[PDB]
């Protein structure tokens, strides 16, 4: 095993990696498994190096997404989302206008300093993406999101794989349970910002502190830095970005799906951990892992003894989902 990429105020975040799982006999691919497992139990956040993803492809799929950012701000907004549950297209947070009318109550007001475009699967009804015109810098746009949308959806899979064999029931059992691919690929943006913002503005952050509500994220980030993740003893922990990995983490719908036996974790990003006048712009990709819309959610078997250790009842993934979503507009 490698050494951890976290090791800090009981938290301890494994960097594993995955082509022994992918590659390996019957004994390396359960070692890694559990490895995988024993990171999702305790953190709830692992690195992965070494997945079947290129570093090349990855950078391009970056440069990618800059150039889209790059674009002016009423071009973006022409792919903002359709309607507030589309969960599609462009969005960038906005504080409310102050106005007249706006009394002393109100006046409480900062938004997350990001900027973020939605991709989901092009084979939804009711649900299409909003493409940006595939025009100079753009041009390759779509197939390259399309692609690295495929590649992701295959190593969601291959990651639920791994849980399955880490916890001793048949290796496949998540297939039928993911096989649509109801996924979400987040691009973010973090513009530069000057460090003075965060002296003045005190919790001023580029990301606040949330758990993700789905099953499993894959968190793509570049050199920048500021992702934190809150330890077991209740303190912010460095996730230090480590060249050519993937930081997966656990959602809440797979905390309960699991019966609590993995942690989703809270996390968030703030100022880099690096002195300087202005910390420039920072990229980083999720993509938002998620059951099929249609399954039902019941613990996992192996993940209670019996009947009475069953903590939550029954959901559908989709309905869970819908009502995150709706709360956050
Ligand atoms: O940008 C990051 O590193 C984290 C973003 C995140 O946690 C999210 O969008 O859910
Ligand atoms: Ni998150």
């Known amino acids: 095993m490698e050494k951890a990429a ?3 105020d009981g938290l301890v975040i494994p960097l594993i990696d995955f082509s022994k799982f992918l590659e390996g006999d019957e004994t390396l691919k359960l070692e890694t498994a559990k490895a995988i ?22 950078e391009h799929v970056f440069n990618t997404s800059a150039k889209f950012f790059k674009l002016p701000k009423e071009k973006k907004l022409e792919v903002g989302w359709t309607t507030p549950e589309a969960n599609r297209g462009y969005s960038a947070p906005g504080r409310e206008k102050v106005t007249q009318l706006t009394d002393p109550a109100e006046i409480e007001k900062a938004p ?3 900027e973020s475009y939605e991709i989901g699967r092009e084979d939804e ?9 595939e025009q100079d810098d753009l041009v390759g746009f779509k197939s390259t999101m399309n692609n690295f949308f495929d590649q992701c959806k295959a190593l969601h899979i291959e990651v639920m794989r791994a849980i399955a064999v880490g916890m001793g029931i048949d290796a496949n059992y998540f297939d039928s349970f993911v096989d649509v691919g109801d ?15 965060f002296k003045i503005n005190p919790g001023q952050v580029r990301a606040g502190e949330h758990t993700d509500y789905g099953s ?19 303190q912010f922990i460095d996730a230090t970005p480590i060249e050519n990995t993937v930081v997966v983490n656990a959602g809440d719908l797979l ?28 990229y980083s990709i999720a993509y938002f892992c998620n059951p099929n819309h249609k399954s039902y959610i019941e613990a996992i ?14 959901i559908n993934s989709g309905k869970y989902l819908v009502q995150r979503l709706a709360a956050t507009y």
Do not use: M
């Open 301 to 314: 078997p192996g993940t209670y003894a019996a009947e009475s250790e069953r903590k939550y009842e029954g």
């Open 112 to 114: 997350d300093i990001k």
């Open 37 to 58: 497992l024993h990171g999702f139990q305790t953190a709830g956040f692992i690195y992965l190096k070494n997945i079947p993803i290129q570093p090349d492809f990855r």
């Open 255 to 282: 905390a309960r799906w699991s019966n609590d036996t993995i942690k989703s974790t809270v996390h968030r990003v703030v100022e880099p951990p690096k002195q300087e006048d202005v910390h420039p712009p920072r």
């Open 6 to 8: 976290v090791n800090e």
């Open 183 to 197: 996924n979400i690929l987040r691009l973010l943006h973090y513009p530069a910002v000057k460090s003075e913002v």
């Open 125 to 133: 009804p009711g649900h299409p993406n909003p493409w940006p015109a």
């Open 216 to 234: 499993i994220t894959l968190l793509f980030q570049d050199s920048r830095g500021g992702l934190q993740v809150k330890s077991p003893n209740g």
